[PDB]
Write a protein that binds this ligand. Sequence first.
Ligand SMILES: O=C1/C(=C/c2cc(O)c(O)cc2O)Oc2ccccc21
Ligand SMILES: [Ca+2]
Length: 835
Amino acid sequence: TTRSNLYKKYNQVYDRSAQSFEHVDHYLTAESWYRPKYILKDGKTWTQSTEKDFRPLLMTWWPSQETQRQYVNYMNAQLGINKTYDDTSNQLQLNIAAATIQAKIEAKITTLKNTDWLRQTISAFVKTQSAWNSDSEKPFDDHLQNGAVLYDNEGKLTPYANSNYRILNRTPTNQTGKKDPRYTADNTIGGYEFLLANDVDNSNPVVQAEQLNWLHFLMNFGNIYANDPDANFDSIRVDAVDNVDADLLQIAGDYLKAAKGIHKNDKAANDHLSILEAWSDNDTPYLHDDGDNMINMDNKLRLSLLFSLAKPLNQRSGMNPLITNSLVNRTDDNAETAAVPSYSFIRAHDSEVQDLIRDIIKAEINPNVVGYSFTMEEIKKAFEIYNKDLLATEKKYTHYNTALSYALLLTNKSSVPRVYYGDMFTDDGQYMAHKTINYEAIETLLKARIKYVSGGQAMRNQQVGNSEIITSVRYGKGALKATDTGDRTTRTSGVAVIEGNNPSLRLKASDRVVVNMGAAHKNQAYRPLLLTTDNGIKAYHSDQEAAGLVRYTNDRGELIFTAADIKGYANPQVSGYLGVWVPVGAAADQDVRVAASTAPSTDGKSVHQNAALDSRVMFEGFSNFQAFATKKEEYTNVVIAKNVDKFAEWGVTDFEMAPQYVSSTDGSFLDSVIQNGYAFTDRYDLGISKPNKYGTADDLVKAIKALHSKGIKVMADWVPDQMYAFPEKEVVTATRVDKFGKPVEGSQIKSVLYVADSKSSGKDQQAKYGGAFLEELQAKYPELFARKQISTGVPMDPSVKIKQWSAKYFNGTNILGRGAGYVLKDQATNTYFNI
Ligand SMILES: O=C1/C(=C/c2cc(O)c(O)cc2O)Oc2ccccc21
Ligand SMILES: [Ca+2]
């Protein structure tokens, strides 16, 4: 190695052994240190080196002479030697320069009695060279982190990182490696493999088995961790469906059927109600054909709410999409069971939050911010602007008409509404510490939903005066149709929502809005629940609070409104109009919800959008931008246990907790900066080795038990796409690719060695729990392991347990800024060093 170009015989490597080199899989890197036969204690005395006397390889060796010059110029400037060397410069001059630097390095080592300062200096120097930084990884692509590398299936130099799999972009749309001819709403292959960080190979049968193992662990967390059967997760969210092999959907579906019997009846299904985050318009019909074993979002209704109500006044659509642009056309929804089950929302922890922070940062701080890779300080200043925009009548960045969106989400038939934490409480600050201006209106709607919201739905779109309004009516419990005359409970249930999306709305003196309440509501007293005022929304918490504002239906069951009742407003809460009316005389404890039956299911689907699923409410119970806890009583899971009576009062039946995995701290993405739980190194570390952002493993256990004590189900966020920040390095044969895994031609990284962080400790929760339940699962549920998965043609393979993650179980990684030449070669032979 160390050539006849220095003080050899002194600076040569101690022995031909591997305990003398800092190596990665027996290869050397530009940041590799080594143990020389002799060190030079200060610039003074050559002494025999100990086992603790490692020194930078770059102190005494260089890949080319060009690099030695670069090293001398750099290390002179660092150590206070204003001598520069230029284009012309013999080997003898630079070897003399290299000695001198060597001598002063050793002097500073003895002065400070550490090498920490030199680790940094060598690192900083290495990152100045194109072959050891981003410049050899360019050009960047639309990957969230600027690009990715794909690990080669057959690398002769790295056979330990080989795979017979790494089958990419097997989305629901593209599961067979061809576009599914059945699903035509999305032209595209319906997603892409490389999203973030280390991309897990969910096409590998051994990894599939391990994803099921993790699923079983989460669904038995209570039993396994705390020997407590009251502290298990009831259900899952499947994170990033469009970025993983869709085989995982048959695996998770089969498990819910085999383990929880969700296929038998609605009681079983509704005790384990599991959701997808699946953005392709193909994913809902895919999931329906697969057996409604889980439910997807209604993306169409989300876009209809966003563009009809939430957008600025000049970017706002007409209101008719609120009726027609959804999985369910709500003109006249009179069905006992909707065709397809779904959940509905206007915002989520990611959707229409991090997007708005990015808009603010890009507009008023850093125009060159990459994807969602924000700094904490960018976030804090963005939130100064955001929090002011929330309280403004004229909003530049934040949603208009939040209460109008929730009035529709919480009265609509044939979808499970999901309330976002950050619409009731502030997106920043401590958990449940600060209420939004919309908290009252949303709370009032949640309590009214339990008491009044049942039966058939009618929505109408009336052109009035200069613009338009919509009416949305529920007929009341037992009344699917406008002609049903109902019983006593029908009479005191039902609701009328009236909305406009234009602040200039003025009815003519001649205009009337006739709202059919249904044949159970003839000649009846009605009172307001919400009314738009000049400064916001007045909530009425009882019949008596509203005593002065009572109005009546006529003999046909119609409420009638005029200009006196309806006009456009502009205030911090309403841009248009909102009016919500309920019948007078509901008992204090009236509850028109319905439980799931044990009657056998007969249509081949697990989940059914009937009155019992319509009775459920989902709560997404975190924000990305929650402040870190300063003391135990501010930990979210401790606050959840303390406030569990609130959630029951609101009719929350399904509590979607944040992912509970201990966050990585690399800061390479938003998730790793605000530590939400989506960026992790250990899949089984649920606040066990260290608190998560939300508290300790014991705080989580107590939160689950508290929710269960009120009959509320708890959802585990299943995140099989990627992992962050592995502590051990590994050398892989890699190819630069776009997020679809297509090779970027004109790249130095092409069947080339590259140094990834892709090995786990072997001493973490993964090492304890990995594969630990595969024998139990194959014994109880052999059919799970008999199924030939669609993408691979073969069953899951539980014959190997994953105690340590390594490169062979991953597709690739986001580019790490280590360059195409980071692994060192002998210049003459043009081959890599191997020990
Ligand atoms: O491509 C889409 C996307 C990205 C998306 C993907 C993710 O896995 C994620 O964690 C967050 C995202 O927002 O958001 C959309 C919304 C509507 C239609 C298409 C897209
Ligand atoms: Ca992936």
